[PDB]
Symmetry: C3
């Protein structure tokens, strides 16, 4: 038996929005420490990884570990039934063939109970390699999605280059090219805006703009994206949650598109 | 000679919007005490019925009874030409071959005189029965249409069930289920937020969501919808005007779509 | 070498927006006194002509006169970048094969630099002899596009008739017809809402509503359009900038559309 209550239903909606469009059929495995999910797009270059701590809920309790296979686009149909600020409680049984979503309003005399039919999804789970990154940076999610959205008009590839307190996004395509250069700074007056490069080695990696355009959809979960780049492993884009996170692992282009399985092996 | 005058043109526009998406070709009957209209969907499940009392006009004069056959989508093209706040004056002659719409502003000697060609529409007036309904309820137009819009994600059929001070909407479909339970409560704080119910008899009917979604388009005429349900009659959805109304009669599904002609016969 | 700076990038976006939908491949000629552009639609009915004086730039310099052939729809992709209020600097070389667009934000130390590949466009330039117009008028750009957008609901032709302190737009079509008449006046409380007419002879011209709908897109540049109509010359619609303008020369219909090339000959 599972009983997870979100203080505001919009949170679980913003989370699910964060990686539908990249993958549609996801296994949500509910443990007693929270809910985790992992999924790889059909091109095998982008790996979504979800972690929600018990702490992120108003109340959470999972008797046994349970796997909830869900179609994200049908789940998001249900998740638009909220009143944005409603009490969303995910509830399920022992060997559930369906989960229940119970939207509660504070005004009471008003409760809505939706049932999502579950699905059997084969689970290819890939151990995420504990690895050190050459250059880890952090910037407001707001400005990153604007950098990505601008340059993707110009090319199918965006390149990230970290050199000595220089972060350089470049896109070169048929109609032309673009550069946006940002340098690390703290503005304590309003500190939710610092660019924090930390560079061991310089890194020059190129990614498909299409995957980055799906990654920036996680911006609705955190004020700042943390990006961690390594010369020869997938890049980590991370949006931080109340006490979990949404992580996109992006196989870079070396430029041949490499696949995420060339770094991460099955369980 | 007909000279109807809406001090605010927006009101004849919100009226037509309430059922342009339901029936296209409608006959507007203009007599001495006001205007009536009646139309049935091409599937003969929905019966729209319009009534505008004279009191709803700022000025109104109709010498002898006149019928205006109109293509609602062409009328709505013209009705989108105002400033919302213009005084729209509806005008016609004897044996009218076209109607006149006269938008007047109060912020300038501005007059946009439009002419809509009239149309010959076969009259299919059906009598109305409205026998003592087992149960009648009323709720905010806002709250009703969101209930309908939510559940229609889940199934093609919405079922309404009235019991002791409990109104239950339920939708059962391929991806899952949804039910909303509301309880009558009258609330002096603000009168617009009161759910009213009178159950002489408990009653449950199932309707096509596709039709309900056209019915909720009437939300733009009153802040509250009135619903009247009986076991062997069509359901009555009613949006009230200042001395008028727009009503939808909906043939229920009792697993089969029944057609309104099994309840209403010709004139 | 060319260095043209807009104080706000917003201006060059709304300028290009004003006629990207009318012609796609435009030659922008930078002389030292500013930038000029002229282009004709594929139907040879509408002639766009642009003029930006240096007075319109925050900063401006052009050593030798240079022509930049540009694809407007590719240019507007770049012009969608930046923060609308950045300092956009247009930059070019001797025989430039590319333009450089430099978005600066006057708040942080961030510079975004785009390069647009140029285009080889044959300079179909027309000598323009505007002559005397029988009638010239001016009204709010707001009100003109609302008149045009309204009346094109009804027909493919809109007729403008100037006669005795009366401006009369008429549209006659299949579903019906509409006429709006405006009279010349002045309200000093708000002096940008005034209709100004000056008539030597009355004029009655008919235009294609498709062309008018592209012309009204210039409203994003000025609060007022100036219209000048003569009997057998194209109509002039003009939106004024601080030091320059965007003007449309529109070959009238006489039931038959004339071609701009029947009034203006090659250079």
């Amino acid at each position: 038996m599972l009983e997870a209550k979100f203080e505001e239903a919009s949170l679980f909606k913003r989370i699910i929005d964060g990686f539908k469009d990249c993958v549609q059929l996801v296994n949500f495995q509910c443990k007693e420490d929270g809910i985790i999910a992992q999924a790889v797009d059909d091109s095998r270059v982008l790996l979504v990884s979800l972690e929600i701590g018990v702490e992120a809920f108003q109340e959470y309790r999972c008797d046994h570990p349970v796997t909830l296979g869900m179609d994200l686009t049908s789940l998001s149909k249900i998740l638009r039934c909220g009143n944005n600020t409603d009490t969303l409680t995910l509830i399920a049984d022992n060997t559930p063939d369906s989960i229940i979503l119970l939207f509660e309003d504070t005004k009471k005399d008003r409760i809505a109970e939706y049932s999502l039919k579950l699905m059997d999804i084969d689970a290819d789970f890939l151990k995420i390699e504990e690895l050190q990154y050459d250059s880890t940076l952090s910037l407001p999610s707001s400005e990153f999605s604007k950098i990505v959205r601008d340059l993707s008009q110009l090319s199918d590839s965006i390149n990230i280059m970290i050199t000595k307190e220089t972060i350089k996004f470049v896109a070169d395509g048929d109609i032309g090219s673009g550069s946006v250069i940002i340098k690390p700074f703290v503005d304590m007056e309003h500190p939710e805006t610092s660019i924090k490069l930390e560079m061991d080695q310089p890194v020059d990696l190129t990614f498909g703009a299409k995957y980055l355009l799906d990654i920036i959809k996680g911006s609705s979960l955190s004020d700042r994206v943390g990006i961690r780049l390594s010369s020869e492993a997938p890049a980590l884009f991370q949006f931080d949650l109340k006490s979990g996170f949404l992580q996109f692992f992006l196989a870079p282009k070396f430029r041949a598109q490499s696949r995420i399985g060339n770094f991460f092996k099955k369980l």
